[PDB]
Amino acid sequence: QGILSLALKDKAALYSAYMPFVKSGGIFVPTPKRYMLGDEVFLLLTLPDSSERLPVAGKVVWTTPAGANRAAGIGVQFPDGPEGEAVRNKIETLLAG
Amino acid sequence: RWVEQLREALIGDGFLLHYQPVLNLQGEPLELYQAFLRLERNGEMMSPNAFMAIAEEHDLITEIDRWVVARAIRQLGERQRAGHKTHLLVRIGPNSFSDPQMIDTIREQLAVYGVPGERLWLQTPESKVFTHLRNAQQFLASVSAMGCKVGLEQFGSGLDSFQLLAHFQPAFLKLDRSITGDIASARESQEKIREITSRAQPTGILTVAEFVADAQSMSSFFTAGVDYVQGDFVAPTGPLM
Numbered sequence A: 001q002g003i004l005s006l007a008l009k010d011k012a013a014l015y016s017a018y019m020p021f022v023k024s025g026g027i028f029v030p031t032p033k034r035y036m037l038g039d040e041v042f043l044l045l046t047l048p049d050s051s052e053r054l055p056v057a058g059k060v061v062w063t064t065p066a067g068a069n070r071a072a073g074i075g076v077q078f079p080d081g082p083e084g085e086a087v088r089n090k091i092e093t094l095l096a097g
Numbered sequence B: 001r002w003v004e005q006l007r008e009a010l011i012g013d014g015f016l017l018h019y020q021p022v023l024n025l026q027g028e029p030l031e032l033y034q035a036f037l038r039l040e041r042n043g044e045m046m047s048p049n050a051f052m053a054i055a056e057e058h059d060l061i062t063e064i065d066r067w068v069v070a071r072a073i074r075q076l077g078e079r080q081r082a083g084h085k086t087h088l089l090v091r092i093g094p095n096s097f098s099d100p101q102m103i104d105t106i107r108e109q110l111a112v113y114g115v116p117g118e119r120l121w122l123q124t125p126e127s128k129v130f131t132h133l134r135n136a137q138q139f140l141a142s143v144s145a146m147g148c149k150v151g152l153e154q155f156g157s158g159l160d161s162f163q164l165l166a167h168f169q170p171a172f173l174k175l176d177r178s179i180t181g182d183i184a185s186a187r188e189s190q191e192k193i194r195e196i197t198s199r200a201q202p203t204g205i206l207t208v209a210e211f212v213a214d215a216q217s218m219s220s221f222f223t224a225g226v227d228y229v230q231g232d233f234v235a236p237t238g239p240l241m
């Protein structure tokens, strides 16, 4: 419903959650709600480091139904620009180790 | 015989097209949609954004370009047999400016379905057109001879925009969002949109404002003289029609 929240607990969960083959980088967010492609959502992310929530205003570029695998959700591509490079960097420099 | 070609028909999922209706304002009424590429796969849907990077490094870019324009002409064909006369805006990468197979496809397809060229509107980013002026200029020439309309998207915020217009002389323009999001409150945008709007009309270049989400914006575009508008506030994107 516009405002989504995703908290990850460890490099592994972030590894399976972090989509890197996307443009500005992406993160898969589990939701049983019906989001359509292009949706501009606001995701409050929390990485394995600290419990600080990072603001991410992205677009829905991937939808899943959890059919006949992987929970059902949406893939949010990070905002083009500085604020995207920030979340994408924080993540890469985390999974790297 | 037929059998082997029939067995082929057992077609699965892959690329398909969704559409966004483009509405009237100052312009002439006409069934106009923008086609957006998509990829269906065992339940999931994908925006090109999620796969154009891998395409970019293997250069499927041009083939997926041709596939799109062809499916466009096709859809344009069915909508005619159904007696509709629909127009379609298709995004096209500069990679297709030099590609010959693109012209040939547009020509073949366009004839296959007996659809006039005026029904196909090819849009390309302004930024890419002057980095590739020549190839872009001959693509315009070739395509225009079949009757297709070519225009510039993301047009308006550069130091040499107005001079491209006089030079490239496109059929239409899709105003940059850097000018379109602001209009309800930005004086700079309100004037710039009018500046662009006044250089287009005398020649008949169609103006388009995309990603529109307000009533205010709608009203500001109308007055400024925009011919068409797209966005969530106007209409969603889907297979619809």
Ligand SMILES: Nc1nc2c(ncn2[C@@H]2O[C@@H]3COP(=O)(O)O[C@H]4[C@@H](O)[C@H](n5cnc6c(=O)[nH]c(N)nc65)O[C@@H]4COP(=O)(O)O[C@H]3[C@H]2O)c(=O)[nH]1
Pocket (backbone or CB within 6 Å): A037, A038, A039, A040, A059, B036, B037, B038, B046, B047, B048, B049, B052, B064, B065, B068, B091, B092, B093, B094, B211, B212, B213, B231, B232, B237
């Ligand atoms: N709810 C909502 N959603 C919005 C809004 N603004 C944009 N979006 C969504 O975000 C995506 C980005 O569109 P784009 O900026 O034109 O960026 C395009 C474009 O760069 C690329 N692309 C797709 N087809 C082609 C093509 O044939 N040629 C080229 N060169 N690029 C293409 O893929 C991207 C994806 O396009 P789409 O699939 O249509 O998915 C769109 C759209 O559904 C909004 O205000 N509200």
